[PDB]
Amino acid sequence: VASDEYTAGGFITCWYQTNIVVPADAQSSCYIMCFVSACNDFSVRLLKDTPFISQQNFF
Amino acid sequence: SDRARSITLGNSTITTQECANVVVGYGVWPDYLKDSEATAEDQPTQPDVATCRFYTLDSVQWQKTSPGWWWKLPDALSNLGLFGQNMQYHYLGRTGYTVHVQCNASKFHQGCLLVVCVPEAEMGCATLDNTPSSAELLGGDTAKEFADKPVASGSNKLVQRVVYNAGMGVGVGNLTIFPHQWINLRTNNSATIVMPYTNSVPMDNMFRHNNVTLMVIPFVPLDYCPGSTTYVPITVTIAPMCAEYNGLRLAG
Amino acid sequence: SDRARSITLGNSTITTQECANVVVGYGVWPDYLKDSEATAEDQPTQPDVATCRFYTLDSVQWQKTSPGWWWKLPDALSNLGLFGQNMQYHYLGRTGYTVHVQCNASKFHQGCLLVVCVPEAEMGCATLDNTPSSAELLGGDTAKEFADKPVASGSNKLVQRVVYNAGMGVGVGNLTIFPHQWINLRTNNSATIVMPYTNSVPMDNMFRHNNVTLMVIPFVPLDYCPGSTTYVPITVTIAPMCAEYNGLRLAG
Amino acid sequence: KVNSMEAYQIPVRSNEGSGTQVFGFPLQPGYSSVFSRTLLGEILNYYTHWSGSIKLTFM
Amino acid sequence: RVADTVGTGPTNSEAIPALTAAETGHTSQVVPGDTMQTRHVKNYHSRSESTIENFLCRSACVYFTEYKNSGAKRYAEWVLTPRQAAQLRRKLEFFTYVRFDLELTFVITSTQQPSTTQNQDAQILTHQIMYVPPGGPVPDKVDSYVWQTSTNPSVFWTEGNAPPRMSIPFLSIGNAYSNFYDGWSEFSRNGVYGINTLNNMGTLYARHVNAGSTGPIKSTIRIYFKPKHVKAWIPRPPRLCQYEKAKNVNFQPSGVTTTRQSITTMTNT
Amino acid sequence: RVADTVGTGPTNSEAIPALTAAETGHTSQVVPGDTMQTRHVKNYHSRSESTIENFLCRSACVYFTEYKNSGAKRYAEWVLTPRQAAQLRRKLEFFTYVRFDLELTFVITSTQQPSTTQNQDAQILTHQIMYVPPGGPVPDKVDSYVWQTSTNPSVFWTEGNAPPRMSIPFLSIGNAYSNFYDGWSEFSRNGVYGINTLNNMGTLYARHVNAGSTGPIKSTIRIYFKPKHVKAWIPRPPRLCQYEKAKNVNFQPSGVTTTRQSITTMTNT
Amino acid sequence: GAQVSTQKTGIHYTNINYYKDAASNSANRQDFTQDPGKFTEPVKDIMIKSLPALN
Amino acid sequence: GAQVSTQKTGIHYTNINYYKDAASNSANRQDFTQDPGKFTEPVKDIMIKSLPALN
Ligand SMILES: O=C(O)c1ccc(NS(=O)(=O)c2ccc(N3C(=O)c4ccccc4C3=O)cc2)cc1
């Protein structure tokens, strides 16, 4: 899960295969939204504390 | 429904939303060489999924005046992947192709392309007592272009490129006996041809014989009104089918 | 009879008249990866007869004082044939080897070599707070040589090469637990070891891990009287076995 | 962009030629800036190891 | 658990598994063999570490308090909540409703305090921890009648032994504890917001049962909660912001993610 | 196990078991009855002490660290490796690949430190040892929020009891731990050599949970590894040289053996 | 009244309950049933991959 | 669910596993299978003693 170069993942990139083509009176700027999820062959192992919650004193 | 298509070869996948079916050759689908048609006595190399997968070539702009383009098939993939590294280490090989040409434009654009795969397209020279050089016929994934006016006769090794003779001295409107589809912008945005291996010998060296030539020719020019996109590319994607290689030697 | 041997892999054939049998690994013969041990989900490339065939490396002279030589296995074939062109286009691969070492001399010469294939031979550095560079460990089909005297400690990225520690800090006479044969000049002129794939992972990248190292070490020096041939070469020949590659990408 | 909704949006537009890149990020959920605070990525900072396939969807 | 990859060959078909509509609110069920040629792999991986009764079933320190055998602060008071400490709280708030049994474990330590007392000589300390269910008498001093423990659960622990532990049932009046409440307890919709009585589970008191020494000793009790027999319903996005208060969901606005140089760069900043 | 000697009489035969070719890389299978007249002996000897799960399955001290209840060095940090200490390390490096489960056992002791503090009077010490899997928060002080241990394994131990112990599974991402790595982790083949992430298995932290005394106490924790359920592959020549570093195989060149006077002398020097 | 169950492996163990309350029992570690189809695919119509999601 | 096995002698003992993980079990001491023929005799051709190793 953490950064190591022995278990590097690879790179995910996107390119124009063909230009965005629009007619007159339609915006030539558009957006894409991306989603991510696991498949049904996915698994995780070995519990540990998350680095993403902290405190300095009791709330 | 009938317009959706997906083709999976190796890593690659192509998906289209507008499709005119797939044309298959002369009704012959690519296959490996039989042992009752083979001549060479060595065991073939068959790399499989390292050669047989889609490769995108460079795009080329379709302009209001554009005459057309051509690519000669084994020598347009000769620098690409392990397809290019098996054909310079081997003396022989045979393969079919799946050629997919893409070109998308709005519903306010118009134009028509003819996409043909022409077996053994031998092309004339501007000067009539010379033959073309290999730097005027072969790109390498860059497209060569036709002309709309005759090529002047000098002391040339130039190709005689004119759209209406197709660079071969034939009517261009009769190229429809070759496996073909049209990309008409108000209907479809892609064309798929599947060529089988066509030759008069069972395998052949691929660095001095080009057994197919793809040509994309506008028959109706691109037209649109002010305010529309002015840049419309045409991308060509080509996958080997059932590639074999025989006669392993040194590179060159 | 028992001394004649022939090994055929692809184009290549090796023939010997003096042979000490063939040593096979740990009693395991090379095989393809199973689907119950595989992790990677893509279809493998298996080139077959374009990778799995004998490749001769450069010869190296055996002199009266010579300490020994080593070659690190996937990175000694990395510039050779289509073996070298499949391991730079793929992220993964696994292969066994057949290593054949030749060295012929008259019946008036004497000497003895130990030929070992050593899994994961990690080698020390002359300076004790540095590790060796990759230009001191890896040849490319040129042999690296041992030394007979300690390497002085500077500010080095040099390997600590001494024959008697084998560059690993172990007794050199205990390298006989690794698959091995001896070339004793009064008996035999060749040695054959067949290594299976040894790793703790099912496939591994081959451009940053060397999973075997061949070493040829004189235990009895070359000796002959005046009038005999003074130049005796040692040639190494190495063939991949059941090579697979997975993870097709760009070259590099 | 992280202090807005513009983070989630990926620009694409009509441009001259094609074969220009749109985005690139490395595969390594639970480390990468892109993936560490996604729903997948936060069930993966409680674990040391991960395996399996991941599917990106684009809209 | 984990499913096996199935081999696939070339396709050219009217099937389009890759194309989908993500507007439908449905996560696509595409597997790798759909989009490419794969080999058949047997998987022996399991999803046994990602069970809810593995994720939440480890002891976690929720609070600690101090009390002395002299002067002021003779005892410690704490109202049981798993919301004083960040780490446990965040894990439970992957869910809206949870139901579990506690196991309390107490780590009680003592430390000699600086003084000018000559000839200190501590006897072993014995500590009493008293659980008081909602309502009923509350001790107002060390040496009140409430420490009789006639009907309040209580444990006594002498130093240098194993930590005490006790199990607590599921004590809610509801059918699950709620980690979020979008309402008021008053019908007027005035007063405190997000306050509910489904999560009441008494108060804990702790004291020394003897002052062993003539000098001052200060003890620290640490409380550990371990959920067990867990069931959980309705999952929620993880907390992105730092917590501020233990009774509120209040937050300082935080950016979505950390930055990087470009949308094509392969490193973090 | 051990085989029985078989009786043999005189020979005069075309059989030649004694003669062999050692160039073939084959160890001869000659037994004593081949070369001489022997009697029949029944052997009842066994090879049960030379099993790999006897050889490697004894506790061995790998490291020890110190920490104090005052001043600097309030806690101890150690990255788990069996390569700090010579004796265990050498035994595992009879093999290239090993696979085992650990059992950690901790011997924690405390020693009063010289001071001019008048009227010291320690309370019993309680120690916390916290295992942190690779990645995740690292304590940067005694009294950080990382010692909450919401999801990190942890033990607490009061003095004068039995040593703590815990079992650890086989934690490799590979199918075996590797004791040797002939490569770089980088694709450029630059940086550190022989460094791999197959042998990661977190970091260990240890502290006092209370300062019992007014005076200074320093503790020492010693970690013991005991392999169990062992499997091992590919044997290697034993280490001949002394180890120098814990991350390298680096060595000072050492002679093959110790000397003696002549090649006919029957004593060592 | 002992239960015998299988251990987590890449044998069996024995357990007896000693207390009269079922909140005193050890945690249930080996329950591995799951059903992701409530949160993935909550759609009323059945989605078939290899067919258009929207006709 | 007890196992009964023989002791090392020049009787029998009883063992029960108490934990739900198979990495908590006591060490396997009594596995005595062996096969030295991988490291001795790794040769492809079968060597027969009482016959020449090399013809
Ligand atoms: O060690 C842990 O288990 C432990 C340590 C810190 C922790 N959470 S924290 O937010 O970092 C925190 C940090 C310090 C204190 N804190 C003190 O250190 C202290 C000293 C004296 C009186 C009151 C207090 C007090 O509230 C409380 C909480 C939880 C548990």
Ligand SMILES: *C(=O)CCCCCCCCCCCCC
């Ligand atoms: C079923 O429970 C009977 C099986 C044999 C029981 C052995 C009991 C072990 C010792 C008593 C445990 C009692 C706990 C209150």
Ligand SMILES: *C(=O)CCCCCCCCCCCCC
């Ligand atoms: C099979 O296991 C039943 C045989 C009789 C068991 C006696 C059990 C001894 C006492 C309980 C040990 C329980 C460990 C969790």
